[model samples]
Target: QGQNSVEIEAFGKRYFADLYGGSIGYFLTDDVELALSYGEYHDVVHGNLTSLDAIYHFGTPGVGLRPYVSAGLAHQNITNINSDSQGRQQMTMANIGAGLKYYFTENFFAKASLDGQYGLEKGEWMAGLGVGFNF
Candidate 1:
């Protein structure tokens, strides 16, 4: 068994606006993984996310397809562009998603997922498609 893996991803949200980011994941077990991500938005909002995800290989790990679910939390900072003097706005947010991954090889894969996010400021629904490397 291996001890580590890494992945990079990008996602877009409808309610909170569009976001682009990358994630790094570490495999803790055959069925569990941990990830950390950082993202930036077009609307002067940035976030940091951390998550624990579970995978069910469904009989084989190298069969080129896998399904997974993930849940996480994030810290977000929103900057007020206009000088309304409202002060800096920040929020703690929750994230949850599920997706399917298809591996072209043992180290490369493509993923598509839907994610939901909620916070004190706003809520969002996101759809994503990205390519990743597992090593």
Candidate 2:
């Protein structure tokens, strides 16, 4: 209920190349947060990925190492898809993940996450590492 955080991440998916993104999160409580993120596919895949997540931290907010679990909704845009229908090029997915956040200081932290995404026609995995600031 009292903190806001912003993060930059480098992440990769099993089906695509590496990606870069940033997120902004608001703490609903000391241990719970809601966040939104967006990223662009860096190579091969021409697209965008966007998500909204709810996260839960396992320990105190300022703890040195805090593990977390997250669930969210995501959207993907495939700009180069050959299909003419808009729906074929745009997709919606459900996301779930677990990760760790390592606090170097009260206001700075780093995180690592492994995530799985489910869509009507496909499923994929992703992993990421990121750094953030809390204010």
Candidate 3:
């Protein structure tokens, strides 16, 4: 469903500065995909996110433009956000998002997505825009 190189991801907000990461996934079917990655983010304790996610690609509405949706489950346990001992943070989070991809050529495409993440108490929101290749 999603897998390509040259793609970049940025995370921020709870973070004072932007943190970056990447992903590589393979299409299990024409519409289904599985992906995995890790990213660095800020909070009471800067968290490390190791995630396993999936995606579904809808057919193109027009030439070179296809819409897709995604969801992922992550375990972002860097050093126990419970440093204060309130035990307020949860380790697992859910991410749900939708985006559009536009291919400029057969091999290069530009994509953008806004994702909503839950299963955590801190913050669960991210917006990502990047590019990838097709083969």
Candidate 4:
């Protein structure tokens, strides 16, 4: 079966001002998924991110609520960075996250997620809430 969805979220971290992003998810099976996302940051680093994730979902497919765990990798492009920064202007990150989706209908849902990202030289925490569509 081919059941896919698109999700959007507004997230914030401790150091960054605010971050917003969205992802496209493809369900490989009832319990496995792959998602790709792109997000933007507001200040400080002023960067953008592209990520790919592998997720394991819990609960029955098409259920009213499902919780999931995921791990992913990303590349971020930093637009404003100091010469003496600890990390490069562009770097790779790895993250582990968890979230839940609540479906209001067959095609519409809300989402909440939190992630801990470890970059080449630093680490940060992110939390976000958003909505999604399924097809």
Candidate 5:
């Protein structure tokens, strides 16, 4: 019914690292939404990285509960302490995941989801769970 929503998410990965991020989206219609997200990942050897991701959602909203799957591209800038490089490296990434939202009120909802992200320097996968506020 409105134009935008904001969400915060936490995620874990096997190869790259664990991450926490937030996203803001503009809902264009009942079945289409687009968002931009920023998150940080910590690796065992690479140290930490900042990532920028773009995602899309498609589904029907009902009783504050919606089931949706999303896909996106991400860019990760790597920063390491024990390495010879001091700058960031950019990689192309992709994700596919599903989530559900349960609304407590008209403008408030709790969300949980799982997603896997791929494409870093050596490939990575992630799982996530988070809450969201919809407007």
Candidate 6:
């Protein structure tokens, strides 16, 4: 009922649950809302991915559409078969992205973002649609 966002990318869908009340709101600046999200990804051979993303929305409510920029980091183990060797698979990634959100109403919004990543181990890039709510 509070902070939750559902995102759909090429690989799969992502769901996020906000850890604390307004954790990303404390960084507000000039109508910009800083959003912090914690989410996880899983698959047959991809294992699991734990990610933290923070975005800066350029405007406040009622504008219909707001654009933003983001930076995130994720970590996962190479438990999937796609790895070069068993247990030698590990990925730590950093991502930078740009997106826009269109508010259909006060409670709901839709988004699309383009992201590129650089990994300390191995990484991938994603572009997709995400839906969210303002709580």
- 4 or 6, which is superior by lDDT? 4
Candidate 6 lDDT over 1-135, as tens digits, reads 112433322223333211111122323443444444433444324355555666677765553888889887766554545446555466788878888878787656777767666766423556656675554
> In each prediction, how many residue pairs overlap at the backbone (N, C-alpha, C within less than 3 A)?
0, 0, 2, 0, 0, 2
Model 2 C-alpha lDDT per residue in residues 14-116, reported as the tens digit of each score: 3426667878888877888898988888766388889999999887867488899999999988766445644337899999999988888877788888888
**For candidate 5, lDDT tens digit of each residue in 1-135?**
343544444433434256666666666666556667666665443434344434444444545566677776766666655546465466667766677766666656666677666764453555556666665
Candidate 1, residues 22-129, lDDT tens digits: the string is 777776765466777766666433443444344433324553777778777777676654545554566777877888878788777788878887775535777877
Return whichever of 1 and 5 wins on TM-score.
1
Against the unseen true structure, what C-alpha lDDT does each candidate score? 0.64, 0.78, 0.64, 0.74, 0.58, 0.55
TM-score for each model = 0.75, 0.83, 0.69, 0.80, 0.69, 0.63
- CA lDDT for candidate 2: 0.78
Q: Counting only residues 3 or more apart in sequence or on different chains, how many pairs clash (N, Cα, C under 3 Å) in candidate 6? A: 2
- Once fitted onto the true fold, the runs of candidate 3 whose alpha carbons sit more than 4 angstroms away are 1-17, 42-45, 60-63, 79-90, 120-123
Error of 3 at 109 (Å): 1.6
Candidate achieving the largest TM-score: 2
Q: Write the per-residue lDDT of candidate 3 for residues 2-97, one digit (tens) a residue.
A: 333223333332231333566666767656767777777643455567778887878842238778899889886554545456433437888887
Candidate 4: pairs in clash: none
Error of 3 at 132 (Å): 1.3
Question: Candidate 1: where are CA atoms >4 Å away?
Answer: 1-3, 8-16, 43-59, 83-87, 120-122
RMSD per model, one decimal: 3.5, 3.6, 5.0, 3.6, 4.0, 7.2
Higher-scoring candidate on lDDT, 3 or 4: 4
| TM-score of model 2 vs. true structure | 0.83
Evaluate model 1: give its TM-score.
Answer: 0.75
